[PDB]
Amino acid sequence: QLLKSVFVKNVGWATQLTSGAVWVQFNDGSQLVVQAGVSSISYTSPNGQTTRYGENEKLPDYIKQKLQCLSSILLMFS
Amino acid sequence: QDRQLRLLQAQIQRLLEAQSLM
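Output (structure tokens, whole complex):
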């Protein structure tokens, strides 16, 4: 289910799953899960509360920041 | 699986462009 987990200083951990999904554990206690085939993203706050967002919803700012950092992480994997 | 990762990169980029247009 898990592949190689990569540590990114100043950000946190980034892991790729067998299902083609990426799971990021940020150093602020939040988590982010995305999948290639799915049209939604999962965000978990530091307090353990999960919220799923769709592609057509306006996302909060911090979600977009973490999606940007995730985009950078995927970029450096090439 | 670099394929699924590339598809994921394109997906996240499209989502970010769409979010910029909101």
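Residues 21 and 38 of chain A are 9 Å apart (CA to CA).
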